[PDB]
Amino acid sequence: KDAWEIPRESLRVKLGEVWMGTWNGTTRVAIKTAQVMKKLRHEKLVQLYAVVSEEPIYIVTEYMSKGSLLDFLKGETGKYLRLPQLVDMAAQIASGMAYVERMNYVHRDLRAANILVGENLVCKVADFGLARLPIKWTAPEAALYGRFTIKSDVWSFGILLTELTTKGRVPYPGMVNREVLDQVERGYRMPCPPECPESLHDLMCQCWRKEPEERPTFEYLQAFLEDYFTSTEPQYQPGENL
Amino acid sequence: DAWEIPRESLEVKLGGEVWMGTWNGTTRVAIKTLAQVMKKLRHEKLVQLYAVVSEEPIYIVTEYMSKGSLLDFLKGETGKYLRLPQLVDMAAQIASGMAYVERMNYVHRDLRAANILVGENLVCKVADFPIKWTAPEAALYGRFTIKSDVWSFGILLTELTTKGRVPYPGMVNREVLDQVERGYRMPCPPECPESLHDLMCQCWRKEPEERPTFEYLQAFLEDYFTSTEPQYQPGENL
Ligand SMILES: C#CCNC(=O)c1cc(Nc2cc(C3CC3)[nH]n2)nc(N2CCN(C(=O)c3ccc(O[S+](=O)=O)cc3)CC2)n1
Ligand SMILES: C#CCNC(=O)c1cc(Nc2cc(C3CC3)[nH]n2)nc(N2CCN(C(=O)c3ccc(O[S+](=O)=O)cc3)CC2)n1
């Protein structure tokens, strides 16, 4: 064992198998019941508090109040979410992934389901169970050949942008996995979502490139979305949904 | 108007009379012997009106649905093999029809399995235009709105998940009126996911305004097995 190890009795309501418990009677934690979540440490990544190595293996992390990003968009709160908040959340995710990027790691499962919302629309990347150094979300070179890179996470980020601009609607509506695999290889890309700016949709298609090394880095993705409503879309005005 | 047709071209009696026949010798139709609203409403998930005979004897010609009603289809021999994936799919198709009704500012006032028809490839459409099905604010005070059709949709989800069993088993209309108003809701039916049952209780809110729209209901059922229940596995009944 190591320094991350804690006794199984040191930590004291179900959520979805992750529970909301209490660590040392003063810390609000979350317990999910590598050595990859330990090394990675960023404000936009869900922080690991402690680990249990005895059966059953526990994972003690920080607590996010608003839950999953997918539930948050589909939920009652998500219908008032406009583009300024949505691009801001995308920027927060792209911030953590940029950290993951320069750390030379791969997430291999970047999607709204694995992103948690907290107070003040704070979004953090979670679940590094497949992390190393979902076909509708996965890059084709990874869903076929197992070529998982940071540029395969950019593809998923491109898919993620559709979930945000549609409030959590499943990518490629009406299509099944084998139907997606066939269409994507043929060049089919998801069209510009209703009331979504083309500059944002262009960024999607850039994340959806046949050539992995032609997809832009998360450092670019972060900078593009953070400076969005000034450099790219300063003429923006509110609509019915976006 | 312009919906009129010559009295040509009835073959068999389906089930005020309902017949399966032919129109103009080529197209298969459903003749109802013996309104003005079915002329305005057009949607792929609403039973489409074809033609009308205005003078007595009155005759209504709509599209034909082969599997009869959704209620008979569930209780019947085919409903025996119906699993939840196909059941949530049928519920999504209906919600789509009611979402059209919703954005057209209309009310159905009788959303139930008896008033929903099934065709080939498990296609379900709303038709026609019952205290166990209708909302209490509509049953007592007469407040029929689209959010009162959402209540019925909540009841509709029970029929689907129980193969068409009458809601509130062992209870009469007097029992239902009092219990529901007392806060009583139907429990989670056997082998039915609690997420789906939560959606039922949403459609069964006391305040009509807090009940979700059919635009929401449609999306929740369509993305159900990816967003809401990804780890679903087949059972004996559901
Ligand atoms: C609004 C409101 C109330 N809040 C919640 O209802 C609420 C709060 C929360 N806060 C948390 C948890 C964590 C810990 C890193 C988890 N940090 N902050 N999390 C969740 N959800 C539920 C749905 N979820 C799942 O179903 C799942 C996915 C993968 C998974 O893989 S794992 O390898 O076993 C096993 C479970 C994921 C978490 N839900
Ligand atoms: C499996 C199998 C064989 N299929 C059928 O046995 C079969 C097929 C069908 N297909 C249809 C009908 C329609 C038209 C809307 C009728 N489109 N597609 N309909 C029915 N029916 C439903 C309804 N039934 C009624 O009796 C009634 C309805 C309203 C009504 O109100 S109206 O204002 O008078 C007064 C009576 C009785 C069986 N039954």
Swiss-Prot record, chain A:
ATP binds at residue 32. Residues 11-229 form the Protein kinase domain. Expressed ubiquitously. Expressed in the skin (at protein level). Platelets, neurons and osteoclasts express 5-fold to 200-fold higher levels than most other tissues. Dephosphorylated at Tyr-236 by PTPRJ. Phosphorylated on Tyr-236 by c-Src kinase (CSK). The phosphorylated form is termed pp60c-src. The active site is at 109 (proton acceptor). The modification Phosphotyrosine is found at residue 236. The SH2 and SH3 domains are important for the intramolecular and intermolecular interactions that regulate catalytic activity, localization, and substrate recruitment. May be involved in blister formation in Pemphigus vulgaris, phosphorylated-SRC is abundant at blister sites but not in normally adherent tissue, which corresponds with loss and disruption of CDH1 in cells adjacent to blisters. Phosphorylated SRC is increasingly abundant at pre-lesional sites of blister formation and occurs prior to changes in abundance of CDH1 and DSG3. Belongs to the protein kinase superfamily. Tyr protein kinase family. SRC subfamily. Part of a complex comprised of PTPRA, BCAR1, BCAR3 (via SH2 domain) and SRC; the formation of the complex is dependent on integrin mediated-tyrosine phosphorylation of PTPRA. Interacts with DDEF1/ASAP1; via the SH3 domain. Interacts with CCPG1. Identified in a complex containing FGFR4, NCAM1, CDH2, PLCG1, FRS2, SRC, SHC1, GAP43 and CTTN. Interacts with ERBB2, STAT1 and PNN. Interacts with DDR1, DDR2 and DAB2. Interacts with CDCP1, TGFB1I1 and TOM1L2. Interacts with the cytoplasmic domain of MUC1, phosphorylates it and increases binding of MUC1 with beta-catenin. It is linked to SRC kinase activity has been shown to be increased in several tumor tissues and tumor cell lines such as colon carcinoma cells. Thrombocytopenia 6: A form of thrombocytopenia, a hematologic disorder defined by a decrease in the number of platelets in circulating blood, resulting in the potential for increased bleeding and decreased ability for clotting. THC6 is an autosomal dominant form. Affected individuals may also have bone abnormalities and an increased risk for myelofibrosis. Non-receptor protein tyrosine kinase which is activated following engagement of many different classes of cellular receptors including immune response receptors, integrins and other adhesion receptors, receptor protein tyrosine kinases, G protein-coupled receptors as well as cytokine receptors. Participates in signaling pathways that control a diverse spectrum of biological activities including gene transcription, immune response, cell adhesion, cell cycle progression, apoptosis, migration, and transformation. This is Proto-oncogene tyrosine-protein kinase Src. It comes from Homo sapiens (Human).
